[PDB]
Amino acid sequence: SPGIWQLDCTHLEGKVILVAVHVASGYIEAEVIPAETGQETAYFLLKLAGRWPVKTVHTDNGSNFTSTTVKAACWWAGIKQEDGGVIESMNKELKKIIGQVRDQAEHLKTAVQMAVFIHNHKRKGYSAGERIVDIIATDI
Amino acid sequence: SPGIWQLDCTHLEGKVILVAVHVASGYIEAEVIPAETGQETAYFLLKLAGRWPVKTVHTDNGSNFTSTTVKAACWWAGIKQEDGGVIESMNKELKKIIGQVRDQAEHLKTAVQMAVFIHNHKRKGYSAGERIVDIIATDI
Ligand SMILES: Cc1cccc(Cl)c1CN1CCc2cc(-c3cnc(C)c([C@H](OC(C)(C)C)C(=O)O)c3N3CCC(C)(C)CC3)ccc2C1
Ligand SMILES: Cc1cccc(Cl)c1CN1CCc2cc(-c3cnc(C)c([C@H](OC(C)(C)C)C(=O)O)c3N3CCC(C)(C)CC3)ccc2C1
């Protein structure tokens, strides 16, 4: 459980928001990209795996599953690539927060990182950031 | 100790590598940018604070300390901004790893994220990624 992540892709303002969700905690990382490609997904995953112990990634669709560039990044980073309700509720919630901060941010990416911050800090009493750290520390 | 980070800036291939070091563990996050500006530093810090519990940032120079954009990001993210050997050895080590992977990466940013990964996973027996998680979990 501690090493399992789910990728998730959603659209906003003509751009794409790529999200990784740590399944057991609900903790997220996200980035704005112009469109989802294999190279963007591969790079996102390389970043994620250098920061957290990513063992398994449930890819968000069959194109990223099939992408040899994504496969190369999973190979490089030691990630097991696998296939994929709660995430749909996650996308609506992320878009909700983005709308609440949109007035504070000129750039979409700034608003998206504000929403990542608010999501990971929200208490509902532990936060997702506390849960992911607690879950991984007990694995150690 | 668990919430203290040090910013660090170094040059390579005509670009800038901006590094945040979790002081107590040696864990790092890094990004390639064209040049260090207040807006790039502010954005980097917003990202960092949504992912880890950043309480205090020792800024890397007086321009980022003074930057009202950096101050605004620290205010937004609840970071105490403060002022600033080991980091110089960190920069040399990061450049060392980047050179070892440079042949595997077309883009500098890819090589930089490979070096972030290798740095955080290296055992020297715990890794920096294990230490930062252990340090923060005990604070909880
Ligand atoms: C709030 C504060 C605290 C302490 C001192 C001072 Cl004196 C201030 C007032 N500041 C004085 C500079 C300043 C710059 C900004 C600012 C300017 N341009 C842009 C592009 C952004 C931002 O993109 C970035 C993230 C910089 C790429 C965006 O996408 O909107 C900015 N940030 C808004 C979001 C933020 C995370 C809060 C950081 C600041 C906003 C507000 C303020 C107001
Ligand atoms: C290694 C492997 C495992 C499983 C299946 C397959 Cl069949 C393969 C072979 N792959 C078959 C596709 C492919 C694409 C690449 C690839 C292509 N273009 C670029 C720009 C990059 C990379 O930028 C990115 C990170 C994609 C923006 C860069 O900066 O160099 C690439 N990555 C090199 C680094 C990586 C983290 C390893 C991920 C792949 C490299 C190697 C391979 C070799």
Q: How was this structure determined?
A: X-ray
DSSP assignment of A37-101, as one string?
Answer: -HHHHHHHHHHHHHHS---EEE-SSHHHHH-HHHHHHHHHHTPEEE---HHHHHHHHHHHHHHHH
Query: What residues contact B127, with CB distance under 8 A and at least 6 apart?
Result: B120, B121
| Buried b / exposed e along B41-61 (16+ C-beta atoms within 10 A) | bbbbbbbbbbbbbbeebbbbe
Ligand 2: residue whose CA is nearest its atom 33: B105
Largest CA distance in chain B: 42
Tokens describing residue B22: 């979790």
Q: Which among A5, A47, A116, A120 is the top mutation candidate for probing chain B, defined by the most B β-carbons within 10 Å of its own β-carbon?
A: A47
Q: Among the atoms of ligand 1, which is closest to the Cα of residue B75?
A: 3
**Positive or negative CA dihedral for B21, B26, B29, B31?**
positive
Cα–Cα distance list, A87 to B97, B98, B122 (Å):
37, 36, 33
Cα dihedral value A31, A33, A35, A36, nearest 10 = -40
Tokens describing residue A120: 């990971």
Of A43, A117, A133, the CB nearest to B110: A43
Query: What residues contact A104, with CB distance under 8 A and at least 6 apart?
Result: A111, A114, B76
Q: What is chain A's length?
A: 140
How many contiguous H segments (helices) and E segments (strands) does chain A have? Answer: 6, 5
The residue type of B120 is N
Query: A93 with A120: CB under 8 angstroms?
Result: no
**Positive or negative CA dihedral for A115, A121, A127, A131?**
positive
Closest CA to B112 of A79, A46, A45: A46
B66 lines ligand 1 (CB under 6 A): no
**Interchain CB distance below 8 Å, A43 and B116:** no
Angle between helix A128-139 and B128-139 (nearest 10): 120
Closest CA to A64 of A33, A31, A42: A42
Residue A73 structural domain: 1-140
Cα–Cα dist A8/A29, whole Å: 10
Number of domains making up chain B: 1
| Buried b / exposed e along A27-65 (16+ C-beta atoms within 10 A) | bbbbbbbeebbbebbbbbbbbbbbbbbbeebbbbeeebb
The domain that contains A7 carries what CATH number?
A: 3.30.420.10
Query: What residues contact A140, with CB distance under 8 A and at least 6 apart?
Result: B126, B130, B133, B134
The two beta strands, B80-82 and B15-22, are: unpaired
From the CA of A81, the nearest ligand is 2
Closest CA to B80 of B96, B58, B63: B58
Cα–Cα dist B26/B32, whole Å: 19
Q: How many CB atoms lie within 10 A of CB A122?
A: 15
Query: What residues contact B14, with CB distance under 8 A and at least 6 apart?
Result: none
Place of tokens 């519990």: B53
Angle made by CA atoms B3, A21, B114, in degrees to the nearest 5: 70
The resolution, in Å, is 1.9
Q: How many CB atoms lie within 10 A of CB A99?
A: 12
**Interchain CB distance below 8 Å, B117 and A52:** no
Q: Calculate the CA B132 to chain-centre distance.
A: 13
Place of tokens 């659209």: A11
How many contiguous H segments (helices) and E segments (strands) does chain B have? Answer: 6, 5
